[PDB]
Design a protein around this ligand. Structure first.
Ligand SMILES: O[C@@H]1CN(c2ncnc3[nH]ccc23)C[C@H]1F
Length: 167
């Protein structure tokens, strides 16, 4: 039993809710919140820009030190950093950005990072400003993640379409 509330159950291990991941994180304080990161951990917009703003830019400060030490992530890769005031940990995961020409096949690799964590709050990777089809992102998620994932979809209209079209 965990403290996630109001989610529709899609499969044995995948749940979905129309919610602002920032507000969800602030309420639940999950062990892991997933960020829709880029390789440079530049949290300018989308989910990443919103999560960083909620940390008062502390996420960006930590991220800049990480990059200065380690260099950029791989597309499809991840790193674990602090969750600041939102969660114990933030798993920064880089899904392909279609608006940069990045291979959508790397989306499965991106979701594989979730399997290193027993429970996660997460957005749909590569959705929104990353330019992938969120219906496709959901299918890959369900077919790849085996740990317990609670998906927050900010857009209510998108939430309804994902549920109604889910196979
Ligand atoms: O529409 C897609 C999904 N997405 C979000 N998903 C969940 N919570 C959120 N909070 C702020 C943004 C946001 C950003 C965009 F890439």
């Amino acid at each position: 039993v965990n403290s996630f509330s109001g989610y529709l159950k899609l499969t044995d291990n995948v749940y979905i809710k129309n919610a602002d991941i920032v507000e969800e994180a602030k309420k639940v304080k999950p062990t892991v919140v997933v960020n829709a990161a880029n390789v440079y951990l530049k949290h300018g917009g989308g989910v990443a820009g919103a999560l960083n703003k909620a940390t008062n830019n502390a996420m960006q400060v930590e991220s800049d030190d990480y990059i200065a030490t380690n260099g950029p992530l791989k597309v499809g890769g991840s790193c674990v950093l602090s969750g600041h005031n939102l969660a114990k940990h933030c798993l920064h995961v880089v899904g392909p950005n279609v608006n940069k020409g990045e291979d959508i096949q790397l989306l499965k690799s991106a979701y594989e990072n979730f399997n290193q964590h027993e429970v996660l709050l997460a957005p749909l990777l590569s959705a929104g400003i990353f330019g992938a089809d969120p219906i496709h992102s959901l299918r890959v998620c369900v077919d790849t993640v085996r740990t317990n994932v609670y998906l927050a979809v900010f857009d209510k209209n998108l939430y309804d379409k994902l549920v109604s079209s889910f196979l």
